Amino acid sequence: ALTPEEYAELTASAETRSKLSEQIALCRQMLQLIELAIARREAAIAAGIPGITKDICGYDTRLDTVGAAHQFSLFLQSPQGQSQDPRTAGMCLRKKCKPHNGWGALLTKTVRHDIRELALQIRELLEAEQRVRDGAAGRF
Ligand SMILES: [Zn+2]
């Protein structure tokens, strides 16, 4: 009981939900990466390496992935979303660091926030899908 154009919308909506779920999966892995960075930071401090004190920043270079993953989450929230020492390698050793100030809690907060936003988007799409099917049943 559906228009050709209603099929096209429902299909694109379901495909968008698919992309949003994959983005949430990516986000959960960013949370693991952040956890891995925190744990590697705690290990370097526990090892008693000269100069590697509790003031050590500890930001891992791979955490820049979190920055671009976050931007892709913002993209998918727009409706145009149709288109050296191994213990410290990669680790930022600045003390009282400010470019990475508070990275552990802030990056955790961003990524967890993106999961909630992406899940909200999925729910809006399920609501809209139910609305289209409601419109076609009313015309039926
Ligand atoms: Zn730093």
Residue numbers in the entry: 322 to 404, 443 to 499
Describing publication, verbatim:
COMPASS is a multi-subunit complex in which the catalytic unit, SET1, is required for H3K4 methylation. An important subunit known to regulate SET1 methyltransferase activity is the CxxC zinc finger protein 1 (Cfp1). Cfp1 binds to COMPASS and is critical to maintain high level of H3K4me3 in cells but the mechanisms underlying its stimulatory activity is poorly understood. Finally, the ability of Cfp1 to associate with SET1A/B and unmethylated CpG islands increases the retention of COMPASS to chromatin.
To confirm this, we solved the crystal structure of Cfp1 RID at 2.3 Å. As defined by the electron density map, Cfp1 RID domain comprises residues 322–508, with one molecule in the asymmetric unit. This region of Cfp1 forms a three α-helix bundle with one Zn2+ atom binding site. The metal binding site is formed by two loops (referred to as L1 and L2). L1 is located at the C-terminus of α1 while L2 is located between α2 and α3. In L1, one metal coordinating residue, C378, is found in the conserved motif XCGΦ (also referred to as motif I) while in L2, C451, H459, C456 are located in the motif CXXXK/RXXCXXHXXW (also referred to as motif II). Comparative analysis reveals that similar to ZC3H, ZC2HC, ZCCHC, THAP, ZMIZ and PARP-Type zinc fingers, CtCfp1 RID domain employs a trio of cysteine residues and the side chain of a histidine to coordinate the zinc ion. However, in stark contrast to ZC3H and THAP, the residues forming the first cluster in CtCfp1 RID ZnF are separated by ∼80 residues; a distance that exceeds all the other zinc binding domain reported to date. Therefore, these observations suggest that the ZnF of Cfp1 RID is a novel type of ZnF. However, mutation of the residues forming both motifs and Tyr380 severely impede the binding of RbBP5 to Cfp1.
